[PDB]
Amino acid sequence: YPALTPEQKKELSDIAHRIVAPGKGILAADESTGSIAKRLQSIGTENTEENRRFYRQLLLTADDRVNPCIGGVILFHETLYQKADDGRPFPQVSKSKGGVVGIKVDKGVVPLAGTNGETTTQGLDGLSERCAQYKKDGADFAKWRCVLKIGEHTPSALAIMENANVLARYASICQQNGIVPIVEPEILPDGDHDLKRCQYVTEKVLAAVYKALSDHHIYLEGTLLKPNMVTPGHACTQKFSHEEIAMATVTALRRTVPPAVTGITFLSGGQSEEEASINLNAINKCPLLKPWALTFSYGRALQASALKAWGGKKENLKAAQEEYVKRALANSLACQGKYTPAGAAASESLFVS
Template identity: 35%
Template sequence: MSAQNVATPGYTFGQKGDANGTKTATDTQDSAFSPLYPFHKPGLAAELISTANSLVNPRGRGIYATDETPEGIAARLNACNPSSASWSDSDAEAKERRRAWRECLYSSMPKEHISGVILYTETLLDFKLAPVLAERGIIPGVRADTDSHPLPGSPAGEPATQGLDDLLPRMQRARAAGARFSKWRAPILCNASTLPTTAALEAQAESLARFAAISQQAGLVPIVEPDVDFAEDASLQRSVEIHQRIIGMIYARCNAYGVRLAHQAVLRATWPEAQL
């Protein structure tokens, strides 16, 4: 996974004005809106900055996603051993196989090429494998989104990412278990003309911004991932247009929620290409 550290103007928390009490340009920008979540603790910024910088520096390392669901990883393990279709494992045995596979992976992956690893909730909370990564200098993270449901009223059943309702306590538990960043993926369907709808873009931008705000509140660096999925008739120009729209909407909603964008969040965007 390639990652880009976000460094854009945003809401600034703390004292207003310069040392002489003169109103600054940032103060003027801040007065244009009131952030919805002005809750950040002053001491949190330094830790978020350190984590975000460690995820993207030095160049040449990347963030590795191992956040498949238990069903997904079971399918992969079964594909490696066709005879496993006849296994009659109990739930406990299947869970132990997943744990052993994850531990083997984390203890052997090349740390010189990997800065962070995204874990599924089971791996983080039940298997408690974050220390295996941390001891090797790899930052543990957690998948924050749960699943997607069709957006109401969308003619194409565009996905709306779920998981916001209990996100804060989940992220607090993740941090207590060793996670230091989190990732939210928001799929966006795109074709040459009719998709995505404005409603879908607004819904996904809103979910990404709320996720980012809650993640930072819990002490985790948010990885914001608008995953644009292009149909065969989408041109490069259309790809660029949709990327510009959704990223602009995400930044606007993040600013509204008081998300610390400058060096404290990571944007993971798809490449603007034709006919992906």
């Protein structure tokens, strides 16, 4: 009873290998309309459809030195249907520059009862038609975010198991409709836990994820994994080097992600624009063996410098676009181990709770 034919299988592998092609990464430009409110209000701008339109249009129409740095662009619903100033739909803008377009399909998180503050994610209702439509309209991959937090009795048995189960459902549905699932099991940096405790939980959680994807029969070569880096909690007093968290990210994934996964696209997680680039470099330089692409899927850590330089004023466009382009060139050096560098609001920490 094949889940997929040969030709669907090779077309998902094809898309997946494009997105993470050597030296390419992803721009996560998929902020909910309510989440992009607090980004905009941090630079004084009002949250109107055309302020979001112009901001998203800022990122997509940047110089062609970004073209080989950005293999894919995850958008939010409203944005997939928005047009540029030259009248081209935003997905054609991205494809014209050699970027594959994706689409966030999760409908936010929801509380699991019986737990200390834990969530599952929702969005599976009608997800099959939506993917069918988003595929007609230009999308080729998808993002579903699950959220886990390290606390004293968290992440619990039930939490890890329901979040792993709905990631796999999501990925099964995505792949029947020709769309590559980005799987996002996120562990947040909230808390005071040390490096090794993030390591032990990352492992425990990816183990449960790849078992869930096996149970649901999903083609691992046409998926991507979007995991946290492995980092001390944001209240940790101990301090850890870039090498030590490289080792600990890379061994956790060695220990748990089968080589069949096409690529691994890290979240930035709240790290500064620059410590994100620096860590991604420490990781691709690790001497250990790493049979999958280790690259980036960054929201805040490609966009903070560009937002502060945009300011709300169309006059600042070319100023802000080159804060975005310097970040994409920087990260495309780090996803190949070639990043050697001093930056100011590229050093601001981007952690929220």
